[PDB]
Design a protein around this ligand. Structure first.
Ligand SMILES: N[C@@H](CCCC[NH3+])C(=O)O
Ligand SMILES: N[C@@H](CCCC[NH3+])C(=O)O
Ligand SMILES: [Mg+2]
Lengths: 296, 296
């Protein structure tokens, strides 16, 4: 299989006057490239995929592709949807516009059965010839891709090469890699990046890397080299920021932190996302003091 | 406030050859009208709102309006979205095409904060002048509209008149009506229709009424007329079917039952929804035997 692994960033999507700030987006991606990130994920959960239009979602994938061109950095395009025809549409777009692979979140809200999830991802995988990474985040979607379903899709569909797990379930991560050690397990939960990598996970799709790409990149590559002491030290050091970045729903804290660090011009969301509480704003600002934040 | 209450049906959306069967859709609504239903909800969760296009969603609202025109039955159009600009668009469409009100599910997947939910619904309520019913279903959306937020919204926005509760939390239903008895609490969970009505809830938005509209209507009207013994009697009778209709994720069982009753032509869903397992198909068929299903 072709794979997309290593340190990866679930990119925030900046807004200026309620529109996607495309110049800021490219600058942010270029900051990720220059700080050791192996791949970028445009328009995931952290990129506010829900509130982008179909056209803006596609524009952000194109900016990612264009910015990473002539570099070693890959684009794992956000392409999930709770409608299979929508997810197939995004997968085919990402393939046709030069993405290296796609991320595809499990359908949210409509709670398909395991049989339905299998057919959903099978339809997506068959529509393209690039790698497909499953994405399990039951706290957001209301459904779970079971270990059996993941393993069946990995074994049955050529391009499905692993899963981004955001479920706080290290038992499942053991279950997945003990029964199917060939898949690429990707951490979707920054606080437990090191435990997942130390069990044979092969990368992270990180929120924190938006702010601290150098630290997440170093953690991941240390762990991949089995330098566990060094990877753990960074994971332990990052714990306070990893958790405060979820004091409110992601991406409210990370955009707050990026704004506080001067990396985006305005603290702007699309409704129903909005600014953090005044208190949580201050809690984020205080935790940030303990870290060295790279500029442009 | 202007309100829409009583016995209401979350209409299934039948498909034929992968498109909305607009003739069957109108026929099903007329079966609801003739069996005492007070309002119909086109394109809710049960109507597979996630997998309809913008156009199909709008077409279904129009058919409901047209079918209920010159009748006593109201249209409470499904208009929710996890993107506020989308929910405002659907709210304005529903107002402009003659719906009596809108249902608006809490944003799914992107998990807004309580402040974000307040602003989301304020934007929706201010966009139209027809009644707005909030819709809380945390098992599907991943977020909860808190009792405080509901109440604030009810008191601050003239068009917001209540909530459809689908959270299995009768304590919350006591909380809501003890602190704000003027709101219309609507049951969105068939198995506990009677407990919610007997505490002062004023209607149901039903899945089961698709199959047994006469029974759900009678249950609601007994309860509103304070015949709690007869409303409870029907609620008890319906428990087996109310429960089997969620053996798999709604609307997979209800469409299976509608197809088994000969009320829709094909057992067709849009992916990621799919046929129930063979075992659940037979279990649904078996439970149905105990009920008398009105035809057309
Ligand atoms: N709000 C819808 C549409 C998003 C379309 C672009 N990502 C959803 O979250 O699925
Ligand atoms: N699948 C998207 C778009 C649906 C648009 C029509 N209801 C969502 O669930 O939000
Ligand atoms: Mg090395």
């Amino acid at each position: 299989k072709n794979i997309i692994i290593g340190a990866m960033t679930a990119l925030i999507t900046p807004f200026k006057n309620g529109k996607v700030d495309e110049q800021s987006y490219a600058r942010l991606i270029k900051r990720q490239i220059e700080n050791g990130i192996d791949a970028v994920v445009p328009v995931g959960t952290t990129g506010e995929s829900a509130t982008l239009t179909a056209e803006e979602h596609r524009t952000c994938i194109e900016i990612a592709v264009e910015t990473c061109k002539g570099t070693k950095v890959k684009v794992l395009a956000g392409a999930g949807s709770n409608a299979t025809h929508e997810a197939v549409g995004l997968a085919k777009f990402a393939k046709e516009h030069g993405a290296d692979g796609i991320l595809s979140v499990a359908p949210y809200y409509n709670k398909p059965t395991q049989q339905g999830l299998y057919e959903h991802y099978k339809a997506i995988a068959q529509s393209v010839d690039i790698p497909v990474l499953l994405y399990n985040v039951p706290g957001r979607t209301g459904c779970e891709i079971s270990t059996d379903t993941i393993i069946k899709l990995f074994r049955d569909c050529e391009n499905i090469y692993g899963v981004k797990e955001a479920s706080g379930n290290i038992d499942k991560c053991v279950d997945l890699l003990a029964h199917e050690p060939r898949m690429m397990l990707i951490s979707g939960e920054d606080a437990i990046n090191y435990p997942i990598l130390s069990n044979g996970g092969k990368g992270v799709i990180s929120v924190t890397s938006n702010l601290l790409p150098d630290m997440i990149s170093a953690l991941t590559h240390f762990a991949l080299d089995e330098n566990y002491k060094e990877a753990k030290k960074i994971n332990d050091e990052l714990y306070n920021i990893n958790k405060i970045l979820f004091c409110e729903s992601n991406p409210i804290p990370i955009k707050t932190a990026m704004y506080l660090a001067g990396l985006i011009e305005s603290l702007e969301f699309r409704l129903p996302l909005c600014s953090p509480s005044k208190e949580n704003f201050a809690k984020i600002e205080e935790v940030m003091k303990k870290y060295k934040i790279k500029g442009f």
